[PDB]
Amino acid sequence: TGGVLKPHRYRPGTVALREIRRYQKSTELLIRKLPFQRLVREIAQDFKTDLRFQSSAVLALQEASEAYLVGLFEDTNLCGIHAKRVTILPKDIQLARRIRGER
Amino acid sequence: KPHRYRPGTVALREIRRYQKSTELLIRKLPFQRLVREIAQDFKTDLRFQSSAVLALQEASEAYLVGLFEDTNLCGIHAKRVTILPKDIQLARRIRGER
Amino acid sequence: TRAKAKTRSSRAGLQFPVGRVHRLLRKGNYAERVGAGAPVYLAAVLEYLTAEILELAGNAARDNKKTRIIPRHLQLAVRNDEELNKLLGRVTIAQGGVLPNIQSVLLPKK
Amino acid sequence: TRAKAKTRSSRAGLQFPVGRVHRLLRKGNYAERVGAGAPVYLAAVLEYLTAEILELAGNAARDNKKTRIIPRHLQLAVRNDEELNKLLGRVTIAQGGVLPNIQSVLLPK
Amino acid sequence: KRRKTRKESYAIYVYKVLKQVHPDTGISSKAMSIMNSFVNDVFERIAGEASRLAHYNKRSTITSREIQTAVRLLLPGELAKHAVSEGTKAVTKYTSA
Amino acid sequence: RKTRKESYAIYVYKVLKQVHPDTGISSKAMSIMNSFVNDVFERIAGEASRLAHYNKRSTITSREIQTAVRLLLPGELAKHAVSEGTKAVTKYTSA
Amino acid sequence: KVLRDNIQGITKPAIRRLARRGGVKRISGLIYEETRGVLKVFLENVIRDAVTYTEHAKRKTVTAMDVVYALKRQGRTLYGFG
Amino acid sequence: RHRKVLRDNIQGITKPAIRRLARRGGVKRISGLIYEETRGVLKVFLENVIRDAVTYTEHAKRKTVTAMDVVYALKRQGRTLYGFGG
Amino acid sequence: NSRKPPPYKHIKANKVIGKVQIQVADLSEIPRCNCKPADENPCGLESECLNRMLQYECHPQVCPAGDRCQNQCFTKRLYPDAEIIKTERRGWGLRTKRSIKKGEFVNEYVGELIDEEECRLRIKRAHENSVTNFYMLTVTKDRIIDAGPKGNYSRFMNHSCNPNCETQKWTVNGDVRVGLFALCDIPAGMELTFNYNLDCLGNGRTECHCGADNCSGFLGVR
DNA sequence: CCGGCACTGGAACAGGATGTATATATCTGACACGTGCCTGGAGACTAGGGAGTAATCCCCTTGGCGGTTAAAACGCGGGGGACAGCGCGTACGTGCGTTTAAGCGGTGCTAGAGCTGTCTACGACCAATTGAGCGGCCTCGGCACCGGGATTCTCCAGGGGATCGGGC
DNA sequence: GCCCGATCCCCTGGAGAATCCCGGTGCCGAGGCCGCTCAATTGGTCGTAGACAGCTCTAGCACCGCTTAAACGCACGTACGCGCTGTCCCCCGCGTTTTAACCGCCAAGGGGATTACTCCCTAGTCTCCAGGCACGTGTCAGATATATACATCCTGTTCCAGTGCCGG
Ligand SMILES: C[S@@+](CC[C@H](N)C(=O)[O-])C[C@H]1O[C@@H](n2cnc3c(N)ncnc32)[C@H](O)[C@@H]1O
Ligand SMILES: [Zn+2]
Ligand SMILES: [Zn+2]
Ligand SMILES: [Zn+2]
């Protein structure tokens, strides 16, 4: 007897294009700082034991990792659009890196 | 009926022939007349040594042979076997030249 | 020190230190000797490359109704100029984001 | 000079000239003062590197049943070893050819 | 206090060239470091190419002529045609008086 | 006239006759090994220079020349050559 | 006091954000275990050189210029830290 | 003073001369429009190297493009070349 | 039986009553399109307007098209036509009097703002007398658009399993709003309808007396 | 309602033709060797400072603790995009007859790289002095946040003139 | 036939209403004002790198003739780009509950950045001699052509499986 009137959900491809135009306008960092900082201190524990990092040294690896990944995902997209698709697959990254030189 | 080899073999067995010799694959005089002409836009009345024209032929060949190696991966990416003009531009654009 | 002092910048008419560039050329192990007009030439090519970027940065900072240059405007300043994008090809500017660009085949057709 | 001349490369047991490496270091505008155990260390590395690209070129040249070494053998002994292929990555070797390699998708059935 | 030691930079010449092309705008602190680094990065390229020019020819000096060629080798098409002008003018104005 | 043009020819040839006594080498091949050495030399020394300049020093020493090897040679080369060098340096002093 | 498993800190939405800034519209489901594998080998080649530059100066702290020089050694200059 | 004007020499890079380079690279079937684009790719790589060779020459006050100017111009782009004197 | 509907306070915008507040934005949290001084319809219907494809409301002060961008369709308010006609047993229903096209801005849906706890209290209060509460639409959490007490001529919009118009969800000036649009262009004289989904808290004793081939179902089932 | 004289489809391997390879004559020009000479590397001292070593001061890296809340995790539905299979036709691979420059030897020649002798202007080096540049301390104010009237507009409001159903 | 106590298209008395104008207040960061100290300007002295003027000689440009390998048209038939259709499944949007990232504190000590002081290790001259570079030379490894020997590629004439389809 009692009901509500909910509107129709967004068509697939709308909340994915809004974020593309939103994040391509901000300038923040996109990975959680503490989880990224524990990862660095774990990786560098294989070269010299019990060493220390500066506050703006853990903050400099993070501004290079992001600019590496964001520029890798721009050259993956072109391979995906080349193969006549919309979805980027696990076999686009490999061709991207191979042609670029890293492998 | 002159035995008519089937398409796809006279190419596949010259691939494996040009990958064992180390000669130069472009004609000497036609290539030299081109280098001398590109270098008229920068200074008139130049003179090239004999070993300066052979230093550019090898660079050019080693550039093209390794551009086509990357072309032949995009074409296989798209599920083809031929290489069109749209495969070269993708390779260059991913390297970072265009 | 029997006469009136003048810097070497005001002689050439520059705003960069011709006195400091000479010292870096000497104490930097570039060559055994250094000519006398090398710093005067190298500073006038540094003020020009600085003007050419600060002007574009100010232009792009004016077009957001803002009055102050922050690191995003320097990114938008070089990424749109065909020669500075080639001079700074492999260079990351901290907190600059990227350029607005959606591929023309992704937009919802009709 | 009561004592007899003894080259500075024999004191170390090497074959590359420690006497010439030192001079090229000093007169190359790399720094102001050049230490005394620096050329003895640099020559020992230069001599070890040129004795790993030749131990492989010799083996590559003995499978073609030849006695001399030609540029093709150096390209083969460089692009078939994964460490030298990473050190000499962006380097062209004149008269080198390419590695025999033909994709697995184009093959007949 | 130990009177912290001085550390130089181009942070007051970058701030003087700006008031010639925009007499009213400002600049940010974290965006001045970028121009500092840009100057420190372009100075090194243009000097380390003149080093090699003067060494290929078996010379022992950097002059006002190795720097002119290093700029033509480093800067792109149109940049490297006004930079040479500004240089060759700021030296004529200096050797005159 | 025709003064000189030094090169590492007669040392590369000496090193060859230790790993392959019955082997020769063509002129072209020689003119490749020569450039290989002239290129690795100024790729290592050009890093010792920058190291000494980053640490505000003036002497190129075995420590700079050794660290410049771990930043250039990859993987197992960086671990073999370093031991190959600490042998020559050790033998030099005790002489 | 050892660490482990912390690679799971580059979570799934955290990769979707980086992809959206890249420009991609749809995203497969096996990208999330392949991106963590490209990241963990970019960090090693840089922290190795940072730790070497540090050990050469007899320090015990990976300062902020070690990272800038280690990134310059690979043609990835980074403006804004030194 | 014989300066016989040169013109339209880019067509000396014939069709078989490009099929051979494509074969050495590992290409099985070539399309029909690659021939007009490979020439455009080559005539751009050649300018960026001959310009620098001529610059290195003008600085030494000579008139003969030598075999070391080319090696230096190539090494300046990350394309080192062994075998011609280094 | 010539009586009339019980009075409803006709209103043009929304009114805040409960514990909810307003989130009016400034001229810096509004996206900017890529249009330009162009044909008669900038940011128009067929015009590939970035905002229009993404269901945003353009703004007269930020768009380069000046002020004539035809995307500003939540201030002009160019609405449908003649009101309640008589149906068989339903309350009154409505219909159209002027013909429209396909995918046009048909009238909005406007009323009061109510939160969930006030919503549950209002429906339970209206439940004891079985007043047959019928007007209750939601958009996000802790924000429910109500059209019972007051509203607009969008409240007598009939339900069907084969609708004619649809209920979208646009974003106007920092806030989210609901605007009904047309599926298929219609001449003047067919009674407008749109489907909607329900949420049962008790039992189901309601049937879809709309009229179609599969439309029997239930007021919560397609 | 399932089969028999004679039909219909599916599989495979020798037999050529080609191509790459097997062992030899022959020969020639480039590689490996002495030989003589010069110049750069080795031996021995001597003087000045760059770096090794010890001791301080304080910056700042790491370590807990609690509290608010935004972002990560999980499961349910519904539809758009990835992938396979057919079908048509267009463009490129293969082989042959023929035209057109590339390649290989002599020959001439002169323009310009290369080398050596004088010598003169130009940059390193030293002492002193004074003004620019850096660290620190105060500022002023252009803007973020609130109010205060309060103007423009409606709106709830019951009410001043028509309206009438009977009223007279 | 005229008229009257209640009853409705319209009106406006306050009340509201809500939002433009205009004005205070409080700030992270920037923009200026002095105390300091030490690096850049001036003025000379001095010795070598670099600019000219020859002068030899070699090697890059230009020509001519001859042989034959490579470029060029041209025709065919076929393998393969490319569009279409169907299907299903896996990636996206929308809720709910859980977890750990952020922020704001306080707290104790590792080690980075200085500074003072005394070696010992490198630059720099002489003095002397042998390692390495150019030159002329012999002789043999590798490049040709000749001839024959198997691998590979492609097909077409034999070779099972089942029935064509007709029927009693
Ligand atoms: C907007 S009200 C409709 C009121 C009235 N019947 C009218 O049309 O004006 C919507 C409610 O009507 C009830 N309803 C069910 N079926 C209906 C129908 N076929 N047409 C109209 N209302 C319906 C539902 O319970 C729903 O809550
Ligand atoms: Zn628009
Ligand atoms: Zn608009
Ligand atoms: Zn129905």
Short mmCIF file of N, CA, C and O and ligand atoms in Angstrom, two decimals, chain I residues 159-162 207-212 214-218, ligand 4:
data_model
loop_
_atom_site.label_atom_id
_atom_site.label_comp_id
_atom_site.label_asym_id
_atom_site.label_seq_id
_atom_site.Cartn_x
_atom_site.Cartn_y
_atom_site.Cartn_z
N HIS I 159 0.50 6.68 -14.35
CA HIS I 159 1.44 5.57 -14.42
C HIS I 159 1.01 4.59 -15.50
O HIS I 159 -0.19 4.43 -15.77
N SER I 160 1.98 3.92 -16.10
CA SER I 160 1.71 2.87 -17.07
C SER I 160 2.94 1.98 -17.17
O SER I 160 4.05 2.37 -16.81
N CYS I 161 2.72 0.76 -17.66
CA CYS I 161 3.82 -0.15 -17.95
C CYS I 161 4.40 0.05 -19.34
O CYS I 161 5.49 -0.45 -19.62
N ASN I 162 3.70 0.76 -20.21
CA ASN I 162 4.23 1.19 -21.51
C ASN I 162 4.12 2.71 -21.57
O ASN I 162 3.14 3.26 -22.08
N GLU I 207 -3.34 -2.54 -8.14
CA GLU I 207 -3.24 -3.05 -9.50
C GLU I 207 -3.14 -1.91 -10.51
O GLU I 207 -3.69 -0.82 -10.31
N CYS I 208 -2.44 -2.18 -11.61
CA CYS I 208 -2.17 -1.19 -12.64
C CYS I 208 -3.34 -1.13 -13.62
O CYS I 208 -3.33 -1.80 -14.65
N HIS I 209 -4.35 -0.32 -13.30
CA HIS I 209 -5.48 -0.12 -14.19
C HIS I 209 -5.18 0.99 -15.19
O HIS I 209 -5.83 2.03 -15.24
N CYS I 210 -4.15 0.75 -16.00
CA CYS I 210 -3.72 1.68 -17.04
C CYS I 210 -4.16 1.25 -18.42
O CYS I 210 -4.69 2.05 -19.19
N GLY I 211 -3.95 -0.02 -18.77
CA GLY I 211 -4.44 -0.55 -20.02
C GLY I 211 -3.35 -0.75 -21.06
O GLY I 211 -2.94 0.19 -21.73
N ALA I 212 -2.89 -1.99 -21.19
CA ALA I 212 -1.89 -2.38 -22.18
C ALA I 212 -1.90 -3.91 -22.25
O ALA I 212 -2.78 -4.57 -21.68
N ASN I 214 0.73 -6.27 -21.55
CA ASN I 214 1.33 -6.97 -20.41
C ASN I 214 1.18 -6.21 -19.10
O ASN I 214 1.71 -6.65 -18.08
N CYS I 215 0.45 -5.10 -19.11
CA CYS I 215 0.48 -4.12 -18.03
C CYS I 215 -0.19 -4.57 -16.74
O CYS I 215 -0.31 -3.76 -15.82
N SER I 216 -0.65 -5.82 -16.64
CA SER I 216 -1.38 -6.23 -15.45
C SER I 216 -0.51 -6.13 -14.21
O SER I 216 -0.74 -5.27 -13.35
N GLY I 217 0.52 -6.98 -14.13
CA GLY I 217 1.54 -6.92 -13.10
C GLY I 217 1.11 -6.49 -11.71
O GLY I 217 0.17 -7.04 -11.13
N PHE I 218 1.80 -5.49 -11.19
CA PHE I 218 1.60 -4.94 -9.85
C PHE I 218 2.29 -3.58 -9.83
O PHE I 218 3.10 -3.27 -10.71
ZN ZN L 4 0.25 -1.12 -16.64
#
